[model samples]
Structure formats: C-alpha cells, structure tokens
Target: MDHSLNSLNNFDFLARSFARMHAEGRPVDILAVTGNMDEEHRTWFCARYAWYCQQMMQARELELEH
Candidate 1:
C-alpha cells in the first residue's frame, strides 16, 4: 500500500493514513473526515474502515488465513 497522502485513486492511502494514526495512539480523523462527507463518501469510508480492521487484525496475528 502506498504510504503517501498524495497518492489517490485507491483506498490504500487513506487506510494507511488511518493505520498510522492508530499506531501513534491518536484518535483517527474518521469522524472529522466523515463530518463533511455526503452519503456516498460516508459509505466509501465505512468500507475502507472495515478493510482497515481486517488489515489491522492480520497485522496483530489475530486473523489467520484459511
């Protein structure tokens, strides 16, 4: 996943950004970002957040590949 915020066109950048914020023990800017988002964007963010959860779980060895 691309780590730079400048990279767009995919959810990876945003997901990684949220991951970083998590690693730093800071509150994710999810609410801040979603506060201004319309329904479509809010839906997209929810998908990304779910993807982030899976990714994080894998990182923690809490999720095992079948």
Candidate 2:
C-alpha cells in the first residue's frame, strides 16, 4: 500500500483495514479509547469517527450507483 497520509485513499484504507480486522476477530486500533481519556474527549472522537464513516459510505454508494 502507499501508506501516504493524504486524500480519500486514506479513508478507503482505514475502512478496508477495519472491515478485515472485524471479520477476522482481530483488534482494530483506529477507534481505540485510551484509559486516561476523559468522557468529553471520547465523545468527540466518536462523533468525528461517525462523520468519517458516513462520508466514506456515501462516497461508496455514489460509486456503486454510477
């Protein structure tokens, strides 16, 4: 993989990596919450992750529709 932190490809990589990890019953690090993190920080992280997933899914839907 390119491994360069840029553009939509990064999201694609993350989604695929997460999906595979879940399927194989492995631990995924992307959405991990550290022990020292406060509730507010955790909430914000979850909200942002949700937004990222939503955008990625919407893009996938458009790609499929075309």
Candidate 3:
C-alpha cells in the first residue's frame, strides 16, 4: 500500500556513521530504516538482526573465555 518501497531499501542504502554511533551506545539518530514496514519485510529484518546480536554475543563470550 505504501509507495515508499516502504523502507528496507533505504536501510541498505543508508549511511554507516549513524549505525556506528548507535553501536557505541552513543546519542544519535540510530536509524536502520525505521517505520514504513510491511509484515514480511519486518520479519526478515528481525531474522537478520538476530544474526548480528547472536554473533556479537558469541564473540564477546569467546573473548572472555580466552
């Protein structure tokens, strides 16, 4: 229904600086293409998001274990 492509394309096309700032837990826009989401798009985003968080968690645990 939305003509926006609804957002995921924007996410892939956007800047990395904001992502970096957010990853540092610092104050910033922190926009990974928010709003304008359809059901399936959001689902894929969540699945992809899970991969990053899971990998980061494992890496930290490995770091501590070393």
Candidate 4:
C-alpha cells in the first residue's frame, strides 16, 4: 500500500507544513491557504484534516506520515 505522502506534489508541501504544525500542537492555516486551492481543495483539505486527526488520536503517528 502507498502509505506515504513524500512523493506527492502539490499536497506534499502542505502535508509537511501541517505535520510541522501538528508537532507543535498548533493548528494549521488551511483557511489562509484556501485561496490558492482549487475546486476540490475544500474536500481535500477536510480529508487532510481527518488524516491529521487520525495521527493526533493515534499518538504514535509520525509527524511526517500524515
């Protein structure tokens, strides 16, 4: 399974940025970056948020794995 985000292009940067925010227990500025997002961006962002929440819930999830 492709349980990785490193190879992703557009979302890779956002993913890493979010991972950093998560590490610091800080909320990411997804709203701020929404202007640059496209039509499906909202859904994608929500999905990413859910993905991050999973990490937060798991506790052992890696900062960069989401």
Residue 37 deviation, candidate 3, in Å?
2.3
Q: What's model 4's TM-score?
A: 0.33
| Residue-wise C-alpha lDDT for candidate 2, range 1-66, written one tens digit per residue | 233344244445645665554444333344332223447646654754665455445545434311
Task: Order the numbered candidates by lDDT, best leading.
Answer: 4, 1, 2, 3
Local accuracy of candidate 4 as per-residue lDDT tens digits, 1-66? 122332344345765786576566544545434545668767766765776566545654455333
The per-residue C-alpha lDDT of model 4 at residue 48 equals 58
Per-residue C-alpha lDDT of model 1 across residues 1-66, encoded as one tens digit per residue: 332342332234445666565554333335434544557766666765766465545555543321
lDDT of residue 10 for candidate 1? 29
| TM-score-better candidate, 2 vs 3 | 3
RMSD of 1: 10.5
Model 1: pairs clashing at backbone N, Cα or C within 3 Å: none
How far does residue 64 in candidate 4 sit from its true spot (Å)?
Answer: 22
Better of 3 and 4 by TM-score: 4
My TM-score estimates for the predictions, one after another, are: 0.31, 0.28, 0.30, 0.33
Q: How many steric overlaps are in each model, in order?
A: 0, 0, 0, 0
The models' CA-based lDDT, in order, is 0.49, 0.45, 0.44, 0.55
Error of model 4, residue 22, in angstroms: 5.1
- Lowest lDDT sum, 10 consecutive residues, model 4, at 1-10
Model 2 CA deviation exceeding 4 Å by range: 1-10, 32-66
Candidates' RMSD to native: 10.5, 12.2, 10.4, 10.3
Residue 40 CA error for candidate 2 (Å)? 20
